[PDB]
Amino acid sequence: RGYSFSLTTFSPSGKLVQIEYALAAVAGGAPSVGIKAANGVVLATEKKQKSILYDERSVHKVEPITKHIGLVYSGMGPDYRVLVHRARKLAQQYYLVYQEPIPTAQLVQRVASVMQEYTQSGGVRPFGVSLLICGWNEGRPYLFQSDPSGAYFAWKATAMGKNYVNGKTFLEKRYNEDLELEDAIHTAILTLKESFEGQMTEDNIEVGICNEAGFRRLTPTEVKDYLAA
Amino acid sequence: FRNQYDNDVTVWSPQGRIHQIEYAMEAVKQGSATVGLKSKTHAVLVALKRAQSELAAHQKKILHVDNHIGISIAGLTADARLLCNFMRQECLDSRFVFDRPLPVSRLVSLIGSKTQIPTQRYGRRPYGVGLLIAGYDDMGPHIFQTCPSANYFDCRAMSIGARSQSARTYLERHMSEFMECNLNELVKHGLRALRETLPAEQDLTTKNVSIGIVGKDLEFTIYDDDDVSPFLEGLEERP
Amino acid sequence: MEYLIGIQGPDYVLVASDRVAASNIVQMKDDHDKMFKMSEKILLLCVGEAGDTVQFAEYIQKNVQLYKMRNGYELSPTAAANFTRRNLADCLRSRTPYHVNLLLAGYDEHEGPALYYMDYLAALAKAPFAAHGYGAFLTLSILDRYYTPTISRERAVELLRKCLEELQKRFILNLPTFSVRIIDKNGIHDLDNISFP
Amino acid sequence: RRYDSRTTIFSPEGRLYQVEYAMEAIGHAGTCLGILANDGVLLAAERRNIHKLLDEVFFSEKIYKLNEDMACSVAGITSDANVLTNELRLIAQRYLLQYQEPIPCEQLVTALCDIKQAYTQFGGKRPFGVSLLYIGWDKHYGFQLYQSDPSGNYGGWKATCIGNNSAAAVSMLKQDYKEGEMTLKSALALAIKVLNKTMDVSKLSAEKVEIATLTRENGKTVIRVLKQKEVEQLIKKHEEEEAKAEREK
Amino acid sequence: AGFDRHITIFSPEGRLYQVEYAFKAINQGGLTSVAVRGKDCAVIVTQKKVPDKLLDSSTVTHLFKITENIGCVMTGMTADSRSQVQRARYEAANWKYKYGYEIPVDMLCKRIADISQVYTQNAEMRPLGCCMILIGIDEEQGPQVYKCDPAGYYCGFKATAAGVKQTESTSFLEKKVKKKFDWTFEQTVETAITCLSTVLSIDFKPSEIEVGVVTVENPKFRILTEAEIDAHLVALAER
Amino acid sequence: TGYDLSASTFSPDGRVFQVEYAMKAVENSSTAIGIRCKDGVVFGVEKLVLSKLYEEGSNKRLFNVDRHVGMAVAGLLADARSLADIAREEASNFRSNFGYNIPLKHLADRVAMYVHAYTLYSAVRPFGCSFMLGSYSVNDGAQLYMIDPSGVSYGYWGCAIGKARQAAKTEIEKLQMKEMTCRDIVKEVAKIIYIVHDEVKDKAFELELSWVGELTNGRHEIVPKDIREEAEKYAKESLK
Amino acid sequence: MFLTRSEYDRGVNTFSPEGRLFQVEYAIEAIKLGSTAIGIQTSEGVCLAVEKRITSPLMEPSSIEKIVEIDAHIGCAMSGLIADAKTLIDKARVETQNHWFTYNETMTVESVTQAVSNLALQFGEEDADPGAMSRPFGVALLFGGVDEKGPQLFHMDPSGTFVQCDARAIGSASEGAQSSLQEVYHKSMTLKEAIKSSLIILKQVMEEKLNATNIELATVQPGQNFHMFTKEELEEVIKDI
Amino acid sequence: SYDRAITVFSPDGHLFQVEYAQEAVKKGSTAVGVRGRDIVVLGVEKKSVAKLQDERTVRKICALDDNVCMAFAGLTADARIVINRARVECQSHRLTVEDPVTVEYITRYIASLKQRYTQSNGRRPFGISALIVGFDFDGTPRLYQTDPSGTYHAWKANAIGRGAKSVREFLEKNYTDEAIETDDLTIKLVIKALLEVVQSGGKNIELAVMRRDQSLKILNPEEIEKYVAEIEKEK
């Protein structure tokens, strides 16, 4: 009824419906999986393209906010770019003020605060993208998810996007805390494999790894090797 | 239904008509009639004032913008008071800046621009006062009418207000005579034309008629209750 | 040109000020009071450029009073000092610097007697005894010579009287009468004006 | 018809429904409990999140340290909470800069509550949907526990629970709490007992609860989140104590 | 429903219907545009339909030059298209002023696309209903083709189409890229014309098509003259 | 269906109806025609005389937007006068900053962009006026440009706006205007204006003619009454 | 046959088919909710009278203030929402004072009404200023004063229109009081007759029996400044009735 | 129809949202004020202890300044904002005119704040009605009441809040010059009146007296017990 349309209106039952509707957008998004291994965090997502015509090198689902922090998204694509840019900017502001790379937890709190701001005003629409943010700070791997609501949770492993619920179950069954990243990247490709609905190919999937060295996107050749397994 | 398309000035109707502007135009009809006519040397405004009660004084229908320009209001008085102030300030501004009486035509263009902005933007209602503006400038006597819609027209003569068609009819038939008329004749012709608007029982009285005259040698003057007596006495009886 | 002196003690703070307000050379008032009571147990004594003194003092007095009404507990003497300093400091950078020199004296049940000194530039220092004014130069030494951290109230008024008599003997300006008040756990208590006829 | 939208329309009968609707949200949230004891004040919360793949990176999910002398627990929309906690931390730091003394506990609560009232009065913003318990020691009133509501109305409670099954907890607390006799040790026990009844899980996981205690030691307040081993001992002690009463029965 | 009617509201299934409605507008124009990228050249071809003989053919164009070396074809509402072209031209110059080098095509699409997201997230404005395809040569990466849609998506494509027959056009192009032979300038132009012609079944004459090309040898965007278009068209028929 | 209430909205089929509704407004107004010949551009408006009371040579629908450019408007007159003001301001600015008379193609574009802005936002309604601008400069040539309420701007060799636009275009089409000279076109414009006017529906019309070209030395000016009178005679005779 | 759709009434800035701007009209109706106030202007002076409508004996009668002094020369009797009157009485008080400061003279009653009227007209969202009430004001004020032209009574309405009235009644019983006023008013009446006549009309319109407490009466004769009859004076006049 | 916006006026010229805010005041706890010759007494009912709730935090009666005290009935949070704003003004007047605020000045200020909220949509009327008691420079006792609308009136005695109608009737009959003759008698009258509406006895009434120059004193629960006892005994 009336509660559904407004974003500043709590429904009888105290649910802000437009945010719930916004989360539904993320669910419709392409599957994305994040596993936090002891030595690293692997972020991977499906980049399935409608046609061979699309040039894959042009746009990347997995992006680097800073040398040690990288993010993947499930949801509305235009929105991801806005958040990524604000994130890249928020980090540079930390560097200028404190001259130290931003701790990952700090960026996720800051990006989330931006998301909450969009939620408050009637004029704007909540962002429809959820971000998985992975980083290596203080010799420790970190993985975090920020939902359109503005809430950040820390996940040892999680999957967002289509078939998220099934993905999480597969991961809970296959997750070992002591896993090394080389094993973990394999676990992730398997998790995506569950819902791919097509032959996975190097182009169809995009994967990124965070370690002491810092966030990097595995190039297509490297993934082909991992897929060969 | 078509209840929709009438709520705001910002909604165009399926057939190209902005209804609120039209509804605003209807406001002028609600007001008491006023007649304006021009002669080669003079411009005259005559008005039929209305009174809330016998004890109450008749309202002011003719207001002086400047020595060379004066207006008669038909419609919501509030909109008129606001527009008149804008006009007065625009005239005062010209004298301070250029030391010239503002050309009457230029003022009407400015009233039109101010009036149009409410029509296209959500927010302020369209002004619902209809104004007859009369002035003598170097070009000559001028009579202009302004609709609640910002459109403005230059007229040999015009009557705006309730039952104003009757006045326009008289004015059209006797129009040719007006150009060469003397001032007394011109006001007399006008008083007769507004008489047509009046209900048959009602008659022009010193109390309900206001005459404003501006001319090459006459600064706009509003002859009022006892000073309309010279112009009214010469008039005859109802046809 | 105006003298403020305060002597802290074991259980009391004694504060005194000249009662003269003057124009170029005419001493318009002989009974100006430069002590403003911020709270039952806090007194701010202010000397400085004319106008700025009354204006800053009143603002601080009212703000301190608002705290009392709003929270029900009076501000601690130390807190008030920090508050006045913040305000004066903020203004120093601004185009409207209040040129005021202040001494704040208060008794807090928990922290005992306290005397704070702030200069126009807004430095705050807690001090055992302090004075502001050209007179201070002449009298600070007398206090330094005869002050014991354990001074008794009777001894303190005596020390203050000695300090003031020097101003009569050597200071060029004529400050004839002084107002003296003591803050103790009981609260601000007025003491007789020490007047050198 | 509908006098319940916009937060600025009083209903015939004078009720602001949007605030009431907001209060409903706190009910869905995980239970948080605070008990005031002569020695210290404690906040214990139920970490509703129990998904196996979640990491305890933070000091606490629901207990936040507003200032050296005070702490808060939040129940309600998490995003709204993050905004309020940031504000509370700034409000406190501003008092310290201005008066160079720690913010009195009631004042921090009164100020946040004022931000919460404003959101209700002005038209565009939704009323904040969070209810939070503040625990702190102030020189003026010693140890104090305060509960806040989306309305902006705050109260001082010796013990209270906000969130799911709050009513059951208050009833249990009403009989169990002994005024003037509580000690942190006894209170931590009361907390485990009430939490056990309110939470659906038969056994408190000891990973499903977070308990934080504020005590003044050596003249400086210490807010410590009890580590899991400490809580596990408390759960075992309760399990045994209740079992012994059942064994007697 | 009512889930549609405001861009900001999200559908119960999170679909932001208004943005989708805008993509429909591009088709309402009834024109299709095809862009193909060769080894050394990038070409944009669009159908030019002149509704009336009176209209000057020179004025009607969907091909605009964002900067000397970047060219764009905008399909959709004509007015919205011109608006985006200006923003692009402003953005292109602002990059040269601030950063000192010509904007890379990808960055122009990114900036233009990002502007579109703001419209998609803010309540008052409507997503502009136009799609812009930019062709440019980047020294590092050779020829580039990028399309920005009303949503804010900015993907770059080896070949792409926009308009009524986009799906059919994409299929034809897809078959031709899959049997990759690489494309010389002539082939890149020929492939484009054959694709537009086959999907529309038009059998085009030089006047009906506007073709724009960027080449590594001559990087500047040039709109081919009717004679040049005819030469390629004649060759296609001959073979 | 709530799709047509605002211009921000887009109909499910992709059409912004409020703009289309605004375009219907111009059809309510009387026809106005502009023809571009080699020497210059001639514009004509059939100005209906609603009442004898209204002064002749007033209620003009042809405005001079700058010394070298003239505007003929059809549609809600109030908006048109306001659009004319926007155009005049733009022309002044181009002279003030760039130091020369505005190229007409640019002027059309700048005014069009202003008109288009109204199309996007929900606070303001689309403008209800369709206007034609024409100028002759020796360097530029003779240019006629027409702007719809949508903000689409295109250059027309010959153009018509108003209630009888379709009928007028057919007549304008048989003119071979490019070869024709400015003086001859004034007679032709009148013939078309007379042909389109419907005597039964519209009681009477006064033809207002304006022209810019080599003859006017590139200044848009009202056609001298002698020339207008000769043309009105040519038209009535042709109407037969 | 009933067509009661309305649908143009809600929301100022909306003109009804027939151009009636109903919200303003409804505001004029509000003054009928208010207590009746009657003003008679006579050569001797202008007299203003109002019915207090005291709800409970505990409420102090003095506080109800339906007749107030804008300045010594001009006074106002207000009927309608008390609160919006307070704003309008304040604009008037400042404007009379501003005129003394700028021109060292006393504003005529008409100018003061024009001044308050200008504020009332602003309800239309005429100005861009945030601090202007969107709703038309719900008060009608009768302003009476001795000026250069002698005793004058002007009546102002929520629309903002103002007119001189020899006698006017604003309020619940204005219709009917006005009718009676029309019969009783003669230009020549002295203020003493008017005070008696106005109080006679009020006694008839008021539900409660007239008592000094229930009525407020004021006069501004040319020599004197605004004067409010005290209970003793009121008792003498009411006794005469 | 005409009840959804503060700005809209109903056919019949009633602004409904302001009236509805006045309904909110009725839901609030009762408060009674009696203007005695030398003492003004303000008394408010306390809803309940709740056992585990500290009572210091909940205070209906507050001192705006040394000479002015206010009691409120209505949404509690709004009262805290109005009370705070009044306190800033009291101190600000002292800064601007160097003189203590008269009871009426504070009443007018509080009223204007409320009217300001009623005047524009986008703000909700404060749902509080307040009794402001004070002693003026002349020393006359003054009691004023304010309502969400912004109307201020002076009442010799008044009750706001739930049951106000019943107490006000009791006060009308009970109030007399004789009752206000003794300061104790004045305190007794308010206690007796609140007793009429309070479900419980003295345990649920909080009462405070302001003397001619003394500061507001909230009577200790024991002092209240003594008064209720004298009243009960006399019954």
Author numbering:
A (entry chain A): 3 to 231
B (entry chain E): 2 to 240
C (entry chain J): 1 to 197
D (entry chain B): 3 to 251
E (entry chain G): 7 to 245
F (entry chain F): 5 to 244
G (entry chain D): 1 to 241
H (entry chain C): 2 to 236
What does the paper say about this structure?
The proteasome plays an essential role in protein degradation and is critical to maintaining cellular protein homeostasis. The mammalian proteasome core particle, 20S, is a large, barrel-shaped protein complex composed of four stacked heptameric rings, including two inner β-rings flanked by two outer α-rings that are each formed by seven different α or β subunits. In each α-ring, the N termini of the α subunits form a gate preventing unregulated protein entry and degradation. There are three types of known endogenous proteasomal activators that bind the 20S to open the α-ring gates.
Endogenous PA28 subunits are known to form two different heptameric complexes: a heteroheptamer composed of PA28α and PA28β subunits and a homoheptamer composed of PA28γ subunits. Previous crystallographic structural analysis of the mouse PA28αβ heteroheptamer found a stoichiometry of four α and three β subunits. The protein complex for this previous study was produced by heterologous coexpression of the two subunits, which form a 4α/3β assembly reportedly due to a more thermodynamically stable α–α interface compared to the β–β interface. A more recent cryo-EM study of heterologously expressed human PA28αβ mixed in vitro with bovine 20S also made a similar conclusion. On the other hand, the PA28 4α/3β assembly derived from heterologous coexpression showed only partial association with native 20S when assembled in vitro. These results suggest that PA28 in a 3α/4β arrangement may have increased binding affinity to 20S compared to a 4α/3β configuration. In this study, we report a human PA28 stoichiometry of 3α/4β, which is different from the mouse PA28 stoichiometry of 4α/3β reported previously. Our attempts at studying the native stoichiometry of free PA28 by native mass spectrometry proved inconclusive, but the data do not discount the possibility that multiple configurations of PA28 may be present in the cell. While our study indicates that PA28(3α/4β) is the preferred configuration that engages with the 20S proteasome, it is possible that PA28 could be present in both 3α/4β and 4α/3β stoichiometries in the cell.
